[PDB]
Amino acid sequence: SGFRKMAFPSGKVEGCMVQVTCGTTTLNGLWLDDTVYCPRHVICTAEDMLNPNYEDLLIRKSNHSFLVQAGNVQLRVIGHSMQNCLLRLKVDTSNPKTPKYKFVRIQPGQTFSVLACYNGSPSGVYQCAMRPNHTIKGSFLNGSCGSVGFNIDYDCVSFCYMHHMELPTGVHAGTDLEGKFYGPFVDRQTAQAAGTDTTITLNVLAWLYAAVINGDRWFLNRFTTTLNDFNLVAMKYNYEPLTQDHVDILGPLSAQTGIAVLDMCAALKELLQNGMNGRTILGSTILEDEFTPFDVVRQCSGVTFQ
C-alpha cells in the first residue's frame, strides 16, 4: 500500500543536461544526438528583456558566441537556428548517453516529472501537472531555465516541457521541445498573469478510485447523478466540467473496484457540499487533482483491497 507523488527515475535525462552560456547569462540546455536545445532568451540582457527581438538579437551572434559545457568537458557549436522559442545548436560531438526519445505536447491535466537544474548540474526531481491555465506549480529559482519535464514509457523518454519563466503569482511557464509555449505567454517582460485556474475533475475522481483501491470507503453514498447535475454543482465549486470521454476514461478503474463513475461523481458532489467532515482521504484533507487515471493504474495495485 501507500500512495505518494512519484516521479520517474531521472537517469536517462541527467545524461542530457548541459550548461549553455552566452555573454553573461547561463542556463541549462538539453543535449540529444548532436543538438542542444535551450531557451532562446539566453541571448538577452539589459532592457533586452523588456522589448526584445530575437530575429535581430540572434543575427548579431555566431556559433562561438555559445559556450556549451558538458561536465568539465566542452562542446563547440557548428550550427544554430531558432525554433519558435528555443535555440537549436548543432555541435561537434554526438551524445554517447542519448536515450531513445521523442517530443510530445501534453494537454492540461496530464502530468510529468521535472528535473530541476542549475549550471547544467541536476539538483532534484519532482512530479507536476499541467494546470488548466497552462502553468505549473513548480519549484524553481533563477538559473533553473532550461530544466526539462518528461515521461517514460518502457525505455523511451517523452520530453514535454522546457522551463522559461516565473509568473508574478509564483508559478511557472515554459514550452514543449518545439519551442511553442503552453498558454498565451511570451518570453518578453510585460504585465502577464496566470488566468484563473480550475480544479482538474478527471484527476480528483482518479484519486478517489485509488483511495478505494487502497481500501478506504467512507466517502461513498447510495446516490447517483446525471452528468448534467454534477456539472451544475461542479461549476460553482470551480471544477472543470466532466464529459463522456472523461467518464469513459474512468472505465477500467470502475471495473477493478466495481464502482460506477456517476456513482463516484455523487460521492464527489457530496464531498463538495458536505466538506471532508474532519477526516482524510488517502492521508490528505483536501481533494488531490494532480494524479491522472494512468498514474493511478501504474502506481496502484492490480487487485483491489475489497
Binding site: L141, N142, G143, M165, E166, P168, Q189, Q192
Partner: peptide, 5 residues
C-alpha cells in the same frame, strides 16, 4: 511584470 528565469 515577470521573472524570465
Amino acid at each position: 511584470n515577470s521573472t524570465s528565469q
